[PDB]
Short mmCIF file of all heavy atoms in Angstrom, two decimals:
data_model
loop_
_atom_site.label_atom_id
_atom_site.label_comp_id
_atom_site.label_asym_id
_atom_site.label_seq_id
_atom_site.Cartn_x
_atom_site.Cartn_y
_atom_site.Cartn_z
N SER A 39 17.89 -48.90 -15.83
CA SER A 39 19.00 -49.53 -15.11
C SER A 39 19.80 -50.30 -16.13
O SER A 39 19.38 -50.48 -17.26
CB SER A 39 18.49 -50.47 -14.06
OG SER A 39 17.59 -51.42 -14.64
N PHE A 40 20.93 -50.81 -15.71
CA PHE A 40 21.81 -51.57 -16.61
C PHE A 40 22.78 -52.37 -15.76
O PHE A 40 23.01 -52.03 -14.58
CB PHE A 40 22.57 -50.62 -17.54
CG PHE A 40 23.47 -49.64 -16.81
CD1 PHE A 40 24.79 -49.94 -16.61
CD2 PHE A 40 22.95 -48.45 -16.38
CE1 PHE A 40 25.59 -49.01 -15.91
CE2 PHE A 40 23.77 -47.53 -15.68
CZ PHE A 40 25.09 -47.85 -15.48
N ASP A 41 23.34 -53.41 -16.33
CA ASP A 41 24.36 -54.17 -15.64
C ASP A 41 25.47 -54.55 -16.64
O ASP A 41 25.63 -53.85 -17.66
CB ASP A 41 23.75 -55.36 -14.85
CG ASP A 41 23.31 -56.52 -15.75
OD1 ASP A 41 23.45 -56.45 -16.99
OD2 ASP A 41 22.84 -57.53 -15.14
N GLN A 42 26.26 -55.57 -16.31
CA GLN A 42 27.36 -55.95 -17.21
C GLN A 42 26.89 -56.22 -18.63
O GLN A 42 27.59 -55.88 -19.58
CB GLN A 42 28.04 -57.22 -16.64
CG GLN A 42 29.29 -57.63 -17.40
CD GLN A 42 29.87 -58.93 -16.91
OE1 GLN A 42 29.33 -59.59 -16.02
NE2 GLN A 42 31.03 -59.34 -17.46
N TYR A 43 25.70 -56.78 -18.77
CA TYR A 43 25.29 -57.35 -20.05
C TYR A 43 24.04 -56.77 -20.66
O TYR A 43 23.83 -56.94 -21.85
CB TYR A 43 25.09 -58.87 -19.96
CG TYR A 43 26.43 -59.60 -19.83
CD1 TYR A 43 26.72 -60.40 -18.74
CD2 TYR A 43 27.34 -59.51 -20.86
CE1 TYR A 43 27.92 -61.06 -18.66
CE2 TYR A 43 28.55 -60.15 -20.78
CZ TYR A 43 28.84 -60.92 -19.68
OH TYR A 43 30.06 -61.58 -19.66
N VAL A 44 23.14 -56.16 -19.85
CA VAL A 44 21.86 -55.70 -20.34
C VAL A 44 21.59 -54.26 -19.92
O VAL A 44 22.18 -53.72 -18.97
CB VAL A 44 20.67 -56.59 -19.87
CG1 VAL A 44 20.95 -58.02 -20.19
CG2 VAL A 44 20.43 -56.45 -18.37
N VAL A 45 20.75 -53.56 -20.69
CA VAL A 45 20.19 -52.28 -20.37
C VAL A 45 18.71 -52.45 -20.25
O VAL A 45 18.08 -53.02 -21.17
CB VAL A 45 20.52 -51.22 -21.40
CG1 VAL A 45 19.83 -49.89 -21.06
CG2 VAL A 45 22.04 -51.05 -21.58
N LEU A 46 18.07 -52.03 -19.14
CA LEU A 46 16.65 -52.06 -19.04
C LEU A 46 16.14 -50.72 -19.51
O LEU A 46 16.51 -49.66 -19.00
CB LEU A 46 16.21 -52.30 -17.59
CG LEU A 46 16.57 -53.64 -16.92
CD1 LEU A 46 15.65 -53.93 -15.74
CD2 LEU A 46 16.53 -54.80 -17.90
N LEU A 47 15.28 -50.75 -20.55
CA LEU A 47 14.82 -49.54 -21.21
C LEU A 47 13.34 -49.42 -21.01
O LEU A 47 12.60 -50.37 -21.28
CB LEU A 47 15.11 -49.62 -22.73
CG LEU A 47 14.76 -48.35 -23.53
CD1 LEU A 47 15.69 -47.19 -23.22
CD2 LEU A 47 14.73 -48.68 -24.98
N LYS A 48 12.89 -48.27 -20.51
CA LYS A 48 11.50 -48.14 -20.08
C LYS A 48 10.74 -47.13 -21.00
O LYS A 48 11.19 -46.04 -21.25
CB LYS A 48 11.42 -47.68 -18.61
CG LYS A 48 10.06 -47.21 -18.19
CD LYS A 48 9.99 -47.08 -16.69
CE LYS A 48 8.56 -47.02 -16.19
NZ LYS A 48 8.42 -46.18 -14.97
N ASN A 49 9.59 -47.62 -21.47
CA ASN A 49 8.63 -46.80 -22.20
C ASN A 49 7.23 -47.17 -21.72
O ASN A 49 6.91 -46.89 -20.56
CB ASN A 49 8.82 -47.09 -23.75
CG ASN A 49 8.34 -45.91 -24.56
OD1 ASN A 49 7.55 -45.07 -24.13
ND2 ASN A 49 8.79 -45.89 -25.83
N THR A 50 6.43 -47.86 -22.55
CA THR A 50 5.17 -48.40 -22.03
C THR A 50 5.43 -49.53 -21.00
O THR A 50 4.72 -49.66 -20.04
CB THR A 50 4.27 -48.85 -23.17
OG1 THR A 50 4.09 -47.75 -24.11
CG2 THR A 50 2.93 -49.37 -22.67
N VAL A 51 6.37 -50.43 -21.34
CA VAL A 51 6.91 -51.40 -20.40
C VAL A 51 8.42 -51.22 -20.32
O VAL A 51 8.99 -50.38 -20.99
CB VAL A 51 6.54 -52.84 -20.80
CG1 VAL A 51 5.05 -52.99 -20.98
CG2 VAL A 51 7.28 -53.24 -22.04
N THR A 52 9.04 -52.04 -19.49
CA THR A 52 10.47 -52.09 -19.41
C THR A 52 10.91 -53.34 -20.16
O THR A 52 10.44 -54.44 -19.89
CB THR A 52 10.95 -52.21 -17.95
OG1 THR A 52 10.57 -51.02 -17.25
CG2 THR A 52 12.43 -52.35 -17.89
N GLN A 53 11.80 -53.14 -21.16
CA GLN A 53 12.30 -54.30 -21.88
C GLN A 53 13.78 -54.45 -21.59
O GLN A 53 14.46 -53.49 -21.25
CB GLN A 53 12.14 -54.20 -23.40
CG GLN A 53 12.53 -52.89 -24.02
CD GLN A 53 12.08 -52.85 -25.45
OE1 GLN A 53 12.71 -53.46 -26.32
NE2 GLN A 53 11.05 -52.06 -25.72
N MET A 54 14.27 -55.67 -21.68
CA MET A 54 15.64 -55.99 -21.41
C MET A 54 16.43 -56.11 -22.70
O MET A 54 16.21 -57.07 -23.47
CB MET A 54 15.80 -57.22 -20.49
CG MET A 54 17.21 -57.60 -20.13
SD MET A 54 17.29 -59.12 -19.19
CE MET A 54 17.39 -60.28 -20.54
N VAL A 55 17.28 -55.14 -22.98
CA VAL A 55 18.06 -55.07 -24.19
C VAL A 55 19.48 -55.60 -23.89
O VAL A 55 20.15 -55.07 -23.00
CB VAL A 55 18.18 -53.62 -24.72
CG1 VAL A 55 18.91 -53.62 -26.09
CG2 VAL A 55 16.81 -52.96 -24.79
N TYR A 56 19.89 -56.60 -24.65
CA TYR A 56 21.30 -57.08 -24.49
C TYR A 56 22.25 -56.10 -25.12
O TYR A 56 22.08 -55.69 -26.32
CB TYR A 56 21.47 -58.47 -25.11
CG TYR A 56 20.99 -59.55 -24.20
CD1 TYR A 56 19.71 -60.11 -24.32
CD2 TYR A 56 21.81 -60.03 -23.20
CE1 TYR A 56 19.27 -61.09 -23.45
CE2 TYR A 56 21.38 -61.01 -22.34
CZ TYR A 56 20.11 -61.56 -22.48
OH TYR A 56 19.74 -62.54 -21.59
N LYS A 57 23.32 -55.76 -24.42
CA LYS A 57 24.28 -54.81 -24.96
C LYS A 57 24.91 -55.29 -26.31
O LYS A 57 25.22 -54.49 -27.18
CB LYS A 57 25.38 -54.50 -23.93
CG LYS A 57 25.02 -53.61 -22.77
CD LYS A 57 26.20 -53.55 -21.80
CE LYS A 57 25.93 -52.69 -20.60
NZ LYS A 57 27.15 -52.57 -19.70
N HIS A 58 25.12 -56.62 -26.40
CA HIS A 58 25.77 -57.15 -27.60
C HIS A 58 24.94 -56.89 -28.82
O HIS A 58 25.47 -57.07 -29.95
CB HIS A 58 26.06 -58.66 -27.49
CG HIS A 58 24.84 -59.50 -27.28
ND1 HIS A 58 24.65 -60.28 -26.14
CD2 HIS A 58 23.70 -59.66 -28.03
CE1 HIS A 58 23.48 -60.87 -26.19
NE2 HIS A 58 22.86 -60.53 -27.32
N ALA A 59 23.67 -56.52 -28.70
CA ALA A 59 22.82 -56.22 -29.82
C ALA A 59 22.66 -54.72 -30.03
O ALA A 59 22.02 -54.33 -31.02
CB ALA A 59 21.44 -56.88 -29.60
N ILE A 60 23.24 -53.89 -29.19
CA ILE A 60 23.16 -52.47 -29.32
C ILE A 60 24.26 -51.99 -30.23
O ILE A 60 25.41 -52.43 -30.09
CB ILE A 60 23.27 -51.77 -27.98
CG1 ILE A 60 22.09 -52.21 -27.08
CG2 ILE A 60 23.38 -50.24 -28.14
CD1 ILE A 60 22.16 -51.69 -25.71
N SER A 61 23.96 -51.11 -31.21
CA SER A 61 24.99 -50.48 -31.99
C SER A 61 25.35 -49.10 -31.47
O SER A 61 26.55 -48.82 -31.25
CB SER A 61 24.63 -50.50 -33.50
OG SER A 61 23.58 -49.60 -33.80
N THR A 62 24.39 -48.26 -31.18
CA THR A 62 24.68 -46.94 -30.64
C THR A 62 23.49 -46.47 -29.78
O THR A 62 22.33 -46.78 -30.08
CB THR A 62 25.00 -45.90 -31.74
OG1 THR A 62 25.34 -44.66 -31.16
CG2 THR A 62 23.86 -45.74 -32.71
N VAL A 63 23.82 -45.74 -28.75
CA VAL A 63 22.87 -45.07 -27.87
C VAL A 63 22.94 -43.57 -28.15
O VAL A 63 24.00 -42.94 -27.89
CB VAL A 63 23.17 -45.34 -26.39
CG1 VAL A 63 22.16 -44.60 -25.51
CG2 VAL A 63 23.08 -46.82 -26.06
N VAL A 64 21.86 -42.99 -28.63
CA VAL A 64 21.82 -41.60 -29.06
C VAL A 64 20.93 -40.81 -28.08
O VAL A 64 19.69 -40.97 -28.11
CB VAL A 64 21.33 -41.44 -30.49
CG1 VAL A 64 21.45 -40.01 -30.96
CG2 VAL A 64 22.08 -42.41 -31.39
N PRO A 65 21.49 -39.93 -27.24
CA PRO A 65 20.65 -39.12 -26.37
C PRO A 65 19.97 -38.02 -27.14
O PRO A 65 20.43 -37.58 -28.19
CB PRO A 65 21.66 -38.49 -25.39
CG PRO A 65 22.92 -39.37 -25.55
CD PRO A 65 22.91 -39.69 -26.98
#
């Protein structure tokens, strides 16, 4: 999931990644 400011990224757990810290999302 994601909102205005964060992306929730799920692997072993779900962590909350702030978009301002993301450089690129590579599918």
Side-chain angles (χ1 to χ4, degrees):
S39 54
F40 62 93
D41 74 0
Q42 184 185 4
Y43 286 120
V44 307
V45 176
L46 297 201
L47 183 72
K48 168 167 196 211
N49 204 341
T50 305
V51 306
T52 296
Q53 47 190 283
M54 181 185 86
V55 185
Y56 278 98
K57 285 174 180 185
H58 59 242
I60 298 176
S61 71
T62 183
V63 178
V64 187

